[PDB]
Design a protein around this nucleic acid. Structure first.
Length: 92
DNA sequence: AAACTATGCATGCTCTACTGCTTCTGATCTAGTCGACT
């Protein structure tokens, strides 16, 4: 029962947007700490009858720090390819 | 004089080739991404 299955991507996107918008490092750290605390509290409340489940913050941590992603190889779609694919798919 | 038969013709139908026009498809040239090398 992974926590990421119950956490919408919109919440993470909003947290990242708030972090970027904030000017002082204190506000960014506060936002990230609030998100992490909510995630940890939800994880603790979900896995009550647990057996040392291998569920952690990796699903969100990898997205927050894509540069450290080693499990997944190169996507093969760079900025030019992404722009092209957006053009065909959206039928612009 | 009337009934049956004969030829004769026309037109629509079917097939096979023939030619020319239009559209689809297969072969041939380059941008990007990843990787190799010095």
């Amino acid at each position: 029962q992974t926590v990421a299955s119950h956490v919408p991507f919109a919440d993470l996107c909003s947290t990242l947007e708030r972090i970027q918008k904030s000017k002082g490092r204190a506000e960014k750290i506060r936002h990230f700490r609030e998100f992490l605390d909510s995630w940890r509290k939800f994880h603790d409340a979900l896995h009550k009858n647990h057996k040392d489940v291998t569920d952690s913050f990796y699903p969100a941590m990898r997205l927050i720090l894509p540069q450290l992603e080693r499990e997944r190889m190169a996507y093969g779609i760079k900025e030019t390819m992404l722009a092209k694919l957006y053009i065909e798919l959206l039928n612009l």
